[PDB]
């Protein structure tokens with residue numbers, strides 16, 4: 605669905621949306637007061653969302669004695685009830701940072717990103733008949749930030765509301781740039797008025813990323829050809845970095 609050089613490019617873009625840098629932040633770990641507990645890694649795995657659990661479980665299977673195995677029974681509890689409780693979990697950000705020095709841990713992160721986020725976004729893009737590279741990037745960024753759940757703010761609901769507005773999908777003859785514009789605008793409205801109020805501040809400050817995607821659409825760079833200019837937070841970046 606995406607080129608190797610398009611996927612490197614999309615990862616560097618999405619890293620700028622999330623951490624203002626094109627270098628993937630495997631070692632990132634913060635509490636953000638968004639109702640999600642601790643947020644970590646390249647795709648922002650979360651204590652509350654069952655994200656951070658799948659990574660550490662898989663890692664513990666590859667390496668049964670790692671510095672993060674003691675956090676595991678607390679993590680199962682949070683994932684169980686989607687709990688944003690920062691505590692139960694002291695020291696974990698530092699150990700997530702340290703585990704990130706291991707290429708194997710970083711790889712588990714890649715594997716979950718592909719299993720939870722990239723592949724499903726690509727499957728959703730193919731059911732849409734979507735086939736501009738920019739649309740794929742926007743679906744992928746969106747699935748990372750909003751998730752693939754059943755809420756009104758998840759990617760499936762936004763896709764459904766985009767398809768309702770333009771009476772159809774690109775595989776059905778609706779112009780794809782029109783479907784994409786609508787989706788980008790519906791996304792910005794969800795970020796600025798999320799149904800889950802705990803993520804309001806964290807999401808309403810993130811909408812510059814939707815503008816950067818919108819900017820590429822209006823500039824006709826729907827195929828993600830280089831060079832790509834991203835300046836989401838004020839800092840300018842010419843992708844791909846080399």
Ligand SMILES: N[C@@H]1[C@@H](O)[C@H](O)[C@@H](CO)O[C@H]1O
Nearest residue numbers: 622643647648748749750806
């Ligand atoms: N709000 C986001 C959720 O959207 C996501 O789980 C994560 C990764 O981007 O980080 C947060 O900031």
